[PDB]
């Protein structure tokens, strides 16, 4: 409980304040060392700061010639330690560099950096204890502090706790090369949130079919299995286009009672039941792809509801839908003029075609509804977009919280349009509902480099304006250089694993200043599960961690 060394300098180096430290022969012989990246406590005029050891080098102290002294001692076979204690007391020194991150304020928020530079004769450096480290961090264990693989740098009793106030309404980045634990960390965080704070909903853009169920050895279990193990019931809603296959897999991997944990829903709708929905999708495709809508589509989009009362116009619309190539359910009847036809049968379909208001233009241009074949399935009668919107922002659903997983791969090549439409609809509804209830849901999207780019930027709008409505993002990109700076600069949290490239670390430092002190560690130490966590404004400095395996988390939390 005394200073490690003696401070012999200080300065302002860029936007940070440093101070040099010297370790004397006594402290070096006793066995006191300092690991690079360690956190120390600096006292200057009665105040306690937080420092991080950056560098370390050897330099002569006083008027000495260490090279000559050591070379001569080696030549003469003179054992310095046992024979010349007075010669081992004038070369045994060592310098260090320390950077003042900020000052911890009691009952308040960590004050970053410092505008005051301490004189040399009024600064001390004390090693930090476990209680102080816990007070620094804590102010459901998600990981514990650890400095590299060095012995004595592991602190299993210092942990970082998951808290909805850290993730809800704020963007979180997740970087790290392949096989280093991004998905495992995401699963751990989501499981802990769902288990501890059941009032938070999530929307998962499952791009790789790895979240609901995972059985290969190349990754940890999935959310469905985790929920079953933890005892969470009736919180997962799964939307897929392969309902039967996924139900078979779920039954196999969860037993005969899988329906108590997962609700499987289809991504199909009978467009002969929602012609207005079909028109809206066709009209919105143009806007979502840059260009402006045609007038013959604007007119229909605005007037279809009125058209519904004119049987002839409705017959025109249904004929356009059928001519597009959408197979109807067996037993449909049209009423052109005052005669009932059967578009399901080829004979009556041709009769109606030859027997046959803006609906005429729609029938002529019905070659534009062909892209809707992906989402069309006869006899469904369930608007999945409305179902998702109600699940996420229902009046009564407030509180309980729901987890929504979308099986994007099952949608073929329409996944991009479907995701853009869903995001636009959800954000518009959230903006409308402002003041009546907060959205309070978290958007999870892996391979975010794909989604964070478009015309009109639905995801740009979500990232840059979701804070007010409690709409938080948590994206994994695997390479910082692939994310636009316009979105990188708006990210509050960070979770960076090992990054091999140099451009990646340079971009990370450029986007977030405090990440310049760990670039060398990231470059040189390829360790799996080792992450540097940064959280504004509660913990505005980089801290290393050893993330926990999902199996271990489940086993520990079962009790």
Ligand X SMILES: Nc1ncnc2c1ncn2[C@@H]1O[C@H](COP(=O)(O)OP(=O)(O)NP(=O)(O)O)[C@@H](O)[C@H]1O
Residues that bind ligand X (CB under 6 A): 176, 178-184, 218-220, 467, 478, 528-529, 547, 549
Which residue, chain included where needed, has tokens 């079953």? 228
Partner that binds at residue 470, options ligand X, a second copy, DNA, none, CB closer than 5 to 8 Å by kind: a second copy
Q: Segment near DNA (CB under 7 A), from 231-239, 331-339, 364-372, 403-411?
A: 364-372
Find out whether 173 and 488 touch, Cβ atoms under 8 Å: yes
Q: Does 150 bind a second copy (CB under 8 A)?
A: yes
Stretch 275-294: interaction string toward DNA, x if CB under 7 A:
---------------xx--x
Binding mask 373-412 for a second copy (x = CB under 8 A): xx----------------------------------x---
Structure token digits, residue 227: 């929920």
Exactly one of 295, 327, 340, 489 binds DNA (CB under 7 A); which one? 295
Is 513 among the residues that bind a second copy (CB under 8 A)? yes
What are the structure tokens assigned to 417, written together? 């349009």
Helix axes 275-288, 311-324, angle to 10 degrees: 60
CA dist 500 to 109, 176, 460, Å?
Answer: 34, 9, 28
Q: Cα separation of 151 and 194, whole Å?
A: 35
* 376 contacts 268 by C-beta, under 8 angstroms: yes
Tokens 């005052």 sit at which residue? Answer: 338
441-500 residues in contact with a second copy (CB under 8 A) are 447, 464-465, 467-468, 470, 478-479, 481-482, 485-486, 488-490, 499-500
Structural contact between residues 98 and 10, judged by C-beta atoms closer than 8 angstroms: no
Partner whose binding site includes residue 538, from a second copy, DNA, ligand X, none (CB under 5 to 8 Å by kind): none
Residues in the chain: 559
291 binds, among ligand X, a second copy, DNA, none (CB under 5 to 8 A by kind): DNA
Q: Is the dihedral of CA 204, 207, 209, 211 positive or negative?
A: negative
Q: Does 356 bind a second copy (CB under 8 A)?
A: no
Residues between 27 and 46 that touch a second copy (CB under 8 A): 28, 33, 35-37
- Cβ 208 to ligand X, closest distance in Å? 8
**Whole-angstrom distance, CA of residue 349 vs CA of residue 344:** 7
Of 366-395, binders to DNA (CB under 7 A) are 367-368
Footprint (CB under 7 A) of DNA, residues 234-263: none
356 contributes a contact to DNA by CB under 7 A: no
Query: How far does CA 58 lie from the centroid of its chain?
Result: 42
**503 scored as a contact of a second copy (CB under 8 A):** yes
CA distance 168 to 194: 12
Give the contacts of 506 (CB within 8 A, at least 6 positions apart). 519
Residues in the site for DNA, rule: CB under 7 A?
A: 290-291, 294-297, 364-365, 367-368, 455
């Amino acid at each position: 409980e005394s200073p490690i060394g003696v401070v012999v300098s200080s300065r302002r180096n860029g936007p940070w304040a440093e101070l040099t430290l010297v370790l004397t022969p006594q402290e070096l012989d006793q066995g006191k060392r300092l690991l690079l990246g360690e956190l120390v406590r600096v006292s200057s005029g009665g105040k306690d700061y937080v420092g991080m050891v950056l560098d370390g080098y050897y330099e002569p102290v006083g008027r000495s010639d260490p090279t000559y002294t050591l070379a001569l001692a080696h030549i003469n076979q003179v054992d310095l330690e046992k024979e010349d204690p007075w010669a081992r007391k004038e070369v045994n020194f060592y310098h260090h560099r320390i950077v003042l991150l900020g000052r911890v304020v009691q009952g308040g928020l960590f004050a970053p950096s410092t505008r005051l530079l301490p004189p040399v004769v009024e600064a001390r450096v004390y090693r930090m204890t476990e209680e102080e480290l816990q007070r620094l961090l804590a102010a459901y264990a998600f990981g514990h502090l650890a400095y590299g693989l060095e012995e004595g740098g592991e602190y299993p009793e210092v942990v970082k706790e998951v808290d909805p106030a850290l993730f809800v309404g704020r963007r979180t980045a997740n970087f790290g090369k392949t096989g280093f634990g991004k998905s495992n960390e995401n699963k751990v965080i989501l499981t802990l949130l769902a288990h501890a704070f059941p009032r938070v909903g999530m929307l998962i853009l499952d791009q790789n079919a790895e979240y609901l169920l995972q059985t290969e050895a190349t990754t940890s279990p999935g959310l469905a299995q985790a929920f079953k193990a933890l005892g969470i019931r009736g919180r997962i809603r799964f939307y897929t286009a392969r309902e039967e296959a996924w139900a078979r897999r779920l039954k196999e991997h969860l037993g005969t009672e899988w329906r108590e944990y997962v609700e499987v829903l289809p991504l199909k709708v009978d467009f002969y039941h929602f012609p207005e929905l079909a028109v809206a999708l066709a009209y919105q495709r143009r806007r979502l792809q840059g260009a402006e809508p045609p007038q013959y589509l604007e007119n229909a989009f605005y007037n279809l509801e009125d058209w519904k009362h004119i049987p002839d116009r409705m017959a025109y619309v249904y004929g356009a839908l059928r001519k597009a190539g959408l197979t109807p359910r067996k037993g449909l009847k049209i009423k052109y003029k005052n005669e009932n036809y059967d578009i399901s049968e080829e004979k009556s379909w041709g009769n109606l075609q030859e027997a046959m208001g803006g609906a005429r233009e729609l029938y002529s241009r019905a070659k534009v509804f062909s892209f809707l074949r992906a989402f069309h399935a006869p006899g469904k009668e369930a608007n999945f977009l409305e179902t998702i919107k109600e699940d996420l922002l229902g009046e009564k659903t407030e509180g309980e919280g729901k987890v929504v997983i979308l099986d994007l791969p099952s949608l073929g090549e329409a996944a991009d349009f479907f995701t853009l439409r869903l995001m636009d609809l959800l954000f518009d509804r959230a903006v409308e509902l402002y003041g009546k209830r907060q959205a309070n849901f978290l958007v999870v999207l892996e391979e975010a480099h794909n989604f964070l780019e478009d015309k009109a930027g639905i995801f740009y709008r979500v990232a840059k304006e979701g804070r007010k409505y409690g709409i938080g993002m948590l994206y994994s990109t695997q390479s910082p250089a692939s994310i636009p700076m316009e979105i990188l600069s708006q990210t509050e949290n960070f979770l960076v694993k090992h990054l091999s490239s140099e451009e990646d670390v340079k971009v990370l430092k450029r986007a977030k200043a405090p990440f310049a002190f760990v670039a060398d560690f990231l470059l040189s130490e390829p360790i799996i599960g080792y992450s540097y966590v940064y959280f504004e404004p509660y913990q505005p400095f980089v801290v290393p961690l050893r993330v926990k395996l999902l199996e271990h988390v489940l086993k520990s939390l079962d009790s």
